[PDB]
Amino acid sequence: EQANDVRATYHYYRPAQNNWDLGAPAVSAYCATWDASKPLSWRSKYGWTAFCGPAGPRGQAACGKCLRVTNPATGAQITARIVDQCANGGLDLDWDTVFTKIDTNGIGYQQGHLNVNYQFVDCRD
Numbered sequence: 001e002q003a004n005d006v007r008a009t010y011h012y013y014r015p016a017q018n019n020w021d022l023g024a025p026a027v028s029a030y031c032a033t034w035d036a037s038k039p040l041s042w043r044s045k046y047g048w049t050a051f052c053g054p055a056g057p058r059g060q061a062a063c064g065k066c067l068r069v070t071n072p073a074t075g076a077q078i079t080a081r082i083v084d085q086c087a088n089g090g091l092d093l094d095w096d097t098v099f100t101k102i103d104t105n106g107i108g109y110q111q112g113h114l115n116v117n118y119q120f121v122d123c124r125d
Contacts, residue, residue: 003055004117010099010108011088016044020093022083029084031063046123047080047097052090058082058120068121071102073114078102079121 018024019040022032029036035048049067051058058065062082069091070077078098080091091098099108108114 001055002117002119003053005115006053006090006117007113008090008099008116009088009113010094011092012095015093015095022048027084030059031083034063035081035083042125044096046125047078047093048083049080049091049093049098050084050086051082052086053118056120059085064123066121066123067118069098069102069116069118071114071116073107074102074104076102076104079123081123082120 014020014024014027020043021027022029022036035043046066051062051067065082066079067082068077068079078101080094080098083093086092094100099114102116103109103114
C-alpha cells in the first residue's frame with residue numbers, strides 16, 4: 001500500500017487548456033465518466049493522476065480514492081486523485097498540481113525526473 005524511492009517525471013499533452021477533460025477524444029480515462037463531470041474548482045483543487053507505480057494495483061476500486069505524495073527533498077507533501085493509468089509510466093496530470101508545488105527550488109523541473117514517495121489515501125471532499 002506504500003511506496004518510496006520511485007523516480008517520478010511529468011508530461012503534458014492536453015491539460016486544463018481543453019479543461020483537461022478526461023473525455024477528450026485521445027485520452028478517455030477510467031473515471032472520466034464520473035469526474036470529468038465535476039466542475040472546475042474541485043477538479044483543479046484536488047489533483048487527479050493515475051493508479052500505477054511498482055507497487056500500486058488499484059483500478060476498479062480506485063475510481064473514487066485519493067493518493068498522498070511526499071517529497072523528502074523539501075519535506076513538502078500534497079494529495080492527488082486516482083483516475084487513469086500510466087501511458088507514460090507514472091503520474092502525468094501534474095505540471096500545476098503536485099510536482100510544481102512540491103518543487104520549491106525547481107531542481108526537478110530543470111532536470112526532468114525526481115525521487116518521491118507516496119501512499120494511498122481517502123479524499124474527504
